Paper text:
Class II Fructose-1,6-bisphosphatases (FBPaseII) (EC: 3.1.3.11) are highly conserved essential enzymes in the gluconeogenic pathway of microorganisms. F. tularensis FBPaseII (FtFBPaseII) is encoded by the glpX gene, and catalyzes the hydrolysis of F1,6BP to F6P and inorganic phosphate.
Ft(Mn2+)FBPaseII-F6P complex (Form B)—Form B represents the most complex crystallographic structure of FtFBPaseII observed to date. The triclinic cell contained two approximate 222 (D2) tetramers separated by about 70 Å, with the orientation of their respective local dyads being slightly different. This could represent the active conformation of the FtFBPaseII enzyme posed for a two-metal catalytic mechanism at high Mn2+ concentrations.
Numbering used by the authors:
A (entry chain D): 5 to 328
B (entry chain A), D (entry chain B): 4 to 328
C (entry chain C): 1 to 328
The structure:
Amino acid sequence: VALEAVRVTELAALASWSQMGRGDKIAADQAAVDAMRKALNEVDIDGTVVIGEGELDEAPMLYIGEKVGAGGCEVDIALDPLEGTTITSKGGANALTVLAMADKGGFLNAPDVYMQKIAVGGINAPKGIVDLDDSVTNNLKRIAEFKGVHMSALVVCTMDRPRHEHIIKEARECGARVILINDGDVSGVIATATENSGIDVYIGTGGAPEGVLAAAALKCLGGQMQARLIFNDEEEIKRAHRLGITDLNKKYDIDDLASGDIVFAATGVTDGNMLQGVKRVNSTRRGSYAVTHSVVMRSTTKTVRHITAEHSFDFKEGIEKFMS
Amino acid sequence: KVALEAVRVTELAALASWSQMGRGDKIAADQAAVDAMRKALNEVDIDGTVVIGEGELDEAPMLYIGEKVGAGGCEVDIALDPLEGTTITSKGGANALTVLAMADKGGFLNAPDVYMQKIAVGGINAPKGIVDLDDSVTNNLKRIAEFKGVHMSALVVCTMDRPRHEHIIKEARECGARVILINDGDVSGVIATATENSGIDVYIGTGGAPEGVLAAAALKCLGGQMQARLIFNDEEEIKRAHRLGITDLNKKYDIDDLASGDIVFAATGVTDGNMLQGVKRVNSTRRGSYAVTHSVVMRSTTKTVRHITAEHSFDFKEGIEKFMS
Amino acid sequence: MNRKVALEAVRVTELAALASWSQMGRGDKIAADQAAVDAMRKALNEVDIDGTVVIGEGELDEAPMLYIGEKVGAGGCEVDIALDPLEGTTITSKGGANALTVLAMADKGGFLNAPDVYMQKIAVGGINAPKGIVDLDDSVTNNLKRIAEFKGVHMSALVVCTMDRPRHEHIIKEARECGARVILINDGDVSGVIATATENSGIDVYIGTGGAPEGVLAAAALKCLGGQMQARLIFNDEEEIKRAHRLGITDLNKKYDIDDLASGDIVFAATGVTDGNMLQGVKRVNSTRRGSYAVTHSVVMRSTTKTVRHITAEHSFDFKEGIEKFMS
Amino acid sequence: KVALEAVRVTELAALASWSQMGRGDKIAADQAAVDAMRKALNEVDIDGTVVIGEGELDEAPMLYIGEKVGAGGCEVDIALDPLEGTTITSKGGANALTVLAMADKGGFLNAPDVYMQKIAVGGINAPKGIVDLDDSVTNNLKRIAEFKGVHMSALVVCTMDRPRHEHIIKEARECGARVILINDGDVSGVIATATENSGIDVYIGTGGAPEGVLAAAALKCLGGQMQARLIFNDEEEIKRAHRLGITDLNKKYDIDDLASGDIVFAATGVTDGNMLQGVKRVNSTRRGSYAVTHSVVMRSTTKTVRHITAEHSFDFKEGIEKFMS
Ligand SMILES: O=P(O)(O)OC[C@H]1O[C@](O)(CO)[C@@H](O)[C@@H]1O
Ligand SMILES: [Mn+2]
Ligand SMILES: [Mn+2]
Ligand SMILES: [Mn+2]
Ligand SMILES: [Mn+2]
Ligand SMILES: [Mn+2]
Ligand SMILES: [Mn+2]
């Protein structure tokens, strides 16, 4: 039941794209959530949303604990109908629609709080190539020697945020190159394991669900990632305690975020550093269509599929027919 | 419900066929693909009857006409070829494919395994009637060139390199058209007419009827026109055809008459062709060694077409024959 | 002019792009521009042209330059050469999108001689777009429905691109109120404008105000790809109108057609430094068949022959040394 | 240095050949390629001497051995094939190329047009002596399989489908290697060993000597090893080797012996093949209709490889024969 996930993320990405460049992040997310639930309920799984649009009193669709699917195997479901709602409204880089499946319990069940992350790709990388509590340069050195390149050849990716100034500055003292994304650290983490992405390491603090989703994909591509939750509120801490978290400062390896039999699928909404975005295409051959660029992958078989889909459409009509 | 899941079958049949590439052994090629395909197809959630396959249950033990396949689901008719181009693959020539098509019951033309005249052109907007087998090559190419908005000498016509086609090749060439020949693979050659950047505008030729119905099914999804006529040389062949309900022995079949209803079509390239790229061995830093497959899966109802590049893990320090069933 | 003058120009943009890339993500916009200028000036002096620079980089402290009037090659035809060693020094310094290295050539006089002022830009691609489809004096909504009708699509399918700058809030609001989609780039309106005529850029229209040398450079490409563009220089102060008058410009508010920006026999070459909406950026590749290399992606195109070439280059390098051994 | 402008010479040669693709007229294919490549070669700022071409003067009027070509520049030796695969192009088959290589004087084995034994493998790191014409096929492959880090059953060996290779095929298959056959074009077939994702690891075969030198000029830029040996069957064949200086008739040439020094290599694809995509007609509305060519150009000294996809405006309402002289 892996391949079907890609039509879910495909339809959600087409819905997001009808709202790209509209300046309305509410309407982009709403379009995506609508398309994702409609499509997800025609998938033969008994899915339980463990990461999604929020918890029930905030999100009427795709909330934590909602059961989804038409019936089938029992699966834990980690969604983000639109990763990059603000990116999409702006037309910026790195927006995605994401869907990951695991056996029940396979995903870290953590609140939607911030998370420190470090990640690197490679098939043959020892767990321990990256350590959150080590220095950037000692992390970069271990990585530069595993890859066989001078440290200054490494390209490090992080988000353009003040909280990242010390990472940016420390990696830059010993020669490494550090490129900045405005948003999209699901894409930024997975790029470390994506051919020709041009990114070797991702370092930074972003949302916790977004980190689990990326860890799911890195679990299928090969690579390492360590993560720590960060709490600001005291209801965040009570939220965590309720979920069974006793150690607020626990480090998580990539296996602690996503273990066992993982299916991951994603579709580009905009051009980013991992997937290409949805495009309008004309042709005399088949008329006009929207192209989507997707990836579905599986941790057991290590198989990765790259899917380019042609979806017929007549753009003489309003674009908002790509909403469901 | 089960469309994308069809690619995994043609992928496994193609890796199986590929391990037999250039081995000189057309039988081992065909057997590896049939085994991979039947193993993979029984593990798809359909209730499938094979209507086009490896043979009748007499001649072929596996994937025979009438065989039930699938793990359980909705009733579908199955049109398959585990390995289109067994000889191609044994030699590593162009255009070998593994093919799998599925329709509603009765969607596929039920014809005996006789020869079949084919003429195919691609284009979503091509009018039915743009090609006719009773009309001449020149007048067919004439209308096609007009429809495509090109001088007729820009048209590229594909046919097989066969003595039986010798007059096709000269007639098309008198009036300026370019005519290229493939050594085998008229499933790929017909489908190439509606494949982007194939470089092939028209297919004209005679070959197997199963191969004709499979190519018609892909063209019904990609948009295009095709006309076919069954060819009878024998009296058993004509008895054969009466019992399948055929009465007009030189009927001309349209695309709609070859494949109709809710068609899904899947193919994976075995060797490089004019429609799909073949299986290749790849090394990388990031994931080590894998085989890459290139596949296409498409659906007539939605007109959605998917191009799938798959990375299947493997260590080639072992033999290559560890991609079989 | 001749046939030597085309495909060799990509060698220039490729060496500048490699030098810029060794400075990608270092946070030093000065060092990046310096590497690009030095590499480009060294490679450009291996190109059989008696070139005169008519368009330089940006500022004299922002890096050195190939200055307006400098003479390069010195062994060939009387060529005006417009060039940007690193378009996107800030972009490159932080690894953002749309950074390019650009070289354009013309017959003497073929480029618009303007000062380095801002310029209003309106661009669309399509080789059948009739001059007149975009007019700066028309409203945004009225250019967009003129473009939607010529593209045979509903207005809400168009993608308008512009820079995330306050001076563009009005173009953004006015284009979104009648249904159009407006995407934003942080920088890079050479890439942004040329995008309108790059297959699968996803960009239908560019509308925005930016540097005038950038506009001419974009125009030289659009002239080669088929497209329309109209431009108007913009002047804030008198000490900067004087610059215009010194250069022969009398009508401060002239609208410039794409012919006026770039005319006659045009050659355009560009190489991507970072990934953008026109060109992929430089990447490190590992392989066993040829070891390690850096891959560049470039385009070179001619206005007289309409010929466009997309060039993927493999340059070997040992990534066991510093990355700083790509500078020149 | 004019090195990259080589590309447009092979591009024009290729557009002219393509206009004869699938016409069953190989002379007309060859002629169109010969004027197209001679006319545009004369715009290149070189002073070139054809050391390898489409004939001697008393056999070939144009691009004959020794002819002075160019418009003035650095003295250079010129190794041409205006169309590699004249019969291929005539029938639309795989692997037709146009080829142009430059070198400092004396850089190319000034070889007479005779048959040439060949064995070639790709890879920047292969030691000279990885392949040797006198070793057995099973011993060469074991060595290559070792160097490429795979089981010999994973290797893909290429060779022409010619009886003279009955025994190459059989011996290589007998210890498990995979052998794929091409109908023609052993320039593309040899270079393919070093082309990324070609699918071919080793070429072993006997074909024309000039085609061997052109290939080795490309392997010299991509990284590889190649042995060649001239073969003679006529006393007239041996006289041509004697006229051209050659004393040792059974010499084994190394790659450096076929091509040495500052080498530029340019090729454009005519038809799809195992090294380059062929010319295609394209219709967009953004730029109208065009022909797309696919070329590669490399230099021995810098090791830089450039892949070049070119768009050539053309009106296909007009006959296709404007892409000529
Ligand atoms: O000040 P910014 O935003 O870095 O823009 C610099 C650009 O302006 C110019 O100086 C003139 O447009 C350009 O050459 C340069 O690329
Ligand atoms: Mn989201
Ligand atoms: Mn979030
Ligand atoms: Mn078969
Ligand atoms: Mn058959
Ligand atoms: Mn600049
Ligand atoms: Mn020849």
